[PDB]
Symmetry: D2
Subunit: 268 residues, 4 copies
């Protein structure tokens, strides 16, 4: 068996072994999937990381902001998996926001050029990935994106939060197009995970106050979550992502699935 047995799935956004995408790709492999990986800048460095995965997988360059990479991508992808074969799953684990639009810089001081870049990479990218890949997706297929609940404003995240609100709106439209191909589109809203950017600020990068704000945020999460929340374990969210890649949520699309320990359902 295996939840994802003989499914060909693309996974983007692995940069380190702490990346959420990394564990997705691992659990997918643990579970009988056959992957195709995308990388962004330091591929040789990335390639170095993905070797640590339980199975080998093709690594492709994908700068989401490059139109040519996008146009060429399905071709480049089909070559890697064999003609007369298509993808069954796609995972979008891509995000970025300049420190001017996130962290300690005041909310009003973020220049739209920085914000437009963050939105380009964090929201629009979900459609442009979906536009590129849907022609080579099999009916019954699934696209999963990574969300962080933006329904209420929170202190540090600022413009990333605004970007996530847009991504949520975008997923809904993508589900409309994806429907034509019999493909589902959903976001997983994860609670906070100790990935390097998160790890950097809890470590004290950018000051002690910002790290205590974040720890206050992390503390509140595990508190509110009736089954707790472990910033250090990215596996429960990866299992959730795989569930949406599987055939076990066949009637769910344009939706958001909350992998946060139930934090978002409790006030305190």
């Amino acid at each position: 068996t295996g939840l994802l047995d003989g499914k060909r799935i693309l996974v983007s956004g692995i940069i380190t072994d702490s990346s959420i995408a990394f564990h997705i790709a691992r659990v997918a492999q643990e579970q009988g999937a056959q992957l195709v990986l995308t990388g962004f800048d330091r591929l040789r460095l990335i390639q170095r990381i993905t070797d640590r995965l339980p199975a080998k997988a093709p690594l492709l360059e994908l700068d989401v902001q490059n139109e040519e990479h996008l146009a060429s991508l399905a071709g480049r992808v089909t070559e890697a998996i064999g003609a007369g074969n298509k993808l069954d799953g796609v995972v979008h684990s891509i995000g970025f926001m300049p420190q001017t639009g996130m962290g300690i810089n005041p909310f009003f001081d973020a220049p739209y050029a920085d914000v437009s870049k963050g939105i380009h990479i964090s929201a629009y990218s979900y459609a442009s990935m979906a536009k590129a890949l849907l022609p080579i997706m099999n009916p019954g297929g699934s696209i999963v994106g990574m969300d962080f609940d933006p329904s209420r404003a929170m202190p540090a995240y600022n413009w990333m939060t605004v970007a996530k609100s847009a991504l949520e709106s975008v997923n809904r439209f993508v589900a409309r197009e994806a429907g034509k191909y019999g493909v589902r589109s959903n976001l997983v809203a994860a609670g906070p995970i100790r990935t390097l950017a998160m790890s950097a600020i809890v470590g004290g990068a950018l000051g002690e106050e910002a790290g205590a704000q974040i720890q206050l945020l992390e503390e509140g999460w595990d508190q509110r979550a009736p089954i707790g929340w472990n910033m250090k374990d990215a596996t429960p969210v990866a299992k959730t992502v795989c569930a949406l890649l599987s055939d076990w949520l066949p009637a769910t699309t344009g939706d958001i699935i909350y992998a946060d320990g139930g934090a978002h359902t409790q006030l305190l």
Copy 2:
């Protein structure tokens, strides 16, 4: 393997072979679960129905409004699966609303004695079942209830919609308690299903106007659903319930999963 291989799961609310509980129980067994069933009032009939299931399973009587059935329940359940064994999953598929509070009788004309019965059975029962069964559930366990999205008012459902609002709220509180035992609690919001009662009313059992109302509702669902909606196929919801009973949504609780074809995400 089976998604629920060697999982011990209780399933309530089977009254006919069209009942959602029936397809839940069926898909569960297909996927390696070992079930215990509860039924209300017409036991002889229910047992007769459960024989059509892929495996034999114990049938226990449970009128949720009967306190004795509730107190005895954990005892009676343990007897059925062997001492030193506990439940891994529990499914609440129970709903009821008097015609005075649902269908064609005007909203203002439902007597609270009737409404109180509908809420007792459709919302409160969810807590009283979890109170009875949590002491005999294993950590890692899951409780799933059945929801019908009450976030907006709809024409016929009336007080059942109100009952569902209450159930959603109850699910959130149950999750707090279930968390102590390492148990998740969630609802599946299904789109409309052609169960006997639905087939009855679309057929004209409640008048010409009410049967046209349902078809109008169903057509709209399937239109809005980017992946369509088939009132006659209860399987995608039973798979969804099974996904939550599995170990693949480990970080989700107090929450609602929409198995509605994505209807709720589209305006039109």
Copy 3:
């Protein structure tokens, strides 16, 4: 002038001079309305209290759970305001929940008889009041109920939280009926107010610990609220209720207006 100049408005749920309803009635009178008050059980005491209001007003008995009181109510109101006169506004500020379903008693230990009583008074009452009063309301009118945001579970409120979810759902159905008369129906979701029950529990009543859970809830409100929150000042909510009774939210119905200082929009 006056925002509510020469509008005839009924106001319920006055029991002390700390009652939100009391400030509603006060600000209403300040704003040129002519009121009719309903009171429950301690009529003589209420009358003693309503004398402290800036204007005289008829006081009518209304135990929402008494069918006789409801049927007689429309008659009794017109009698009090003169035949050929109709109500322009109605205010529902009524709630009740037994301590078995609220406070320190565990969630699972509330007997449905107690919960059913709480729902009867806090949710259903909203409907049975609209049913009584709509026939004698003028087009352009407003029915306002009092809400406490139940979208997430919180520690002490328990079954009152569940009751508020139900009331919300009820408001949506009531708007459908009220629409036929050209009448709006809405809830104000207020933040916590140091009303007598709140005053009792912050006082070491029910333990130091339950009061500390509550103070954490109260503190957090003022923290999260971008304009802060003053538990001792009920005036901002009475103003909000008056805004909905006015002709200045004419296209808003079946909705919830949050007078919480914006707390519900911020995570922390």
Copy 4:
């Protein structure tokens, strides 16, 4: 008295006498406000229109995408109202989206430069206007933006819908900053209004299919609205906007008020 008596309020986004901003400004003046208007391109043309307003009001140029205009804005505003005077209200009624991101062009075919332009004007501008204006606003003041409900995907609106999700997110962050000055920030989510562009598309300017999409949308709104919805009457949304500019929603911020006839609360 007038709801907005002797309040100094800035109003942007007037381009025609059908513009929502126009009725806002009209009802604001009717209600005792002293306005300051902003215009964007066709200033000479706008002045001709604003002459049709019940009172004269200074017209200032403001291209939201021009930083210089933003920086100069507070100065230019203070000149118009007298030094030592500040604003009590600000209205953001600004939106724009290229036909590539809205209407008949497929969702996947919108170029990010066009999308980025739309979000710039429709979402970011709400922040950049507030940054410019908060220093010269009196405590107790109010900022209102115009929303169109993006919580569910709809056929034509596409990237404008995405922009509004972002704008909602932004409103929440702006209220945190606005709070320091004792100022509220809120959006009014309006149902569809027959402004020239809407009338245009209904006429067939974007094809037969798109004009039928809109009427189908408008028809559904008035059905669902328990109090109906008149696409041709913008006064109820302008009345709503004025209510938020008043001192009658003092405990509401970072929030959204729905002036939609209650459509969003009904399923059908």
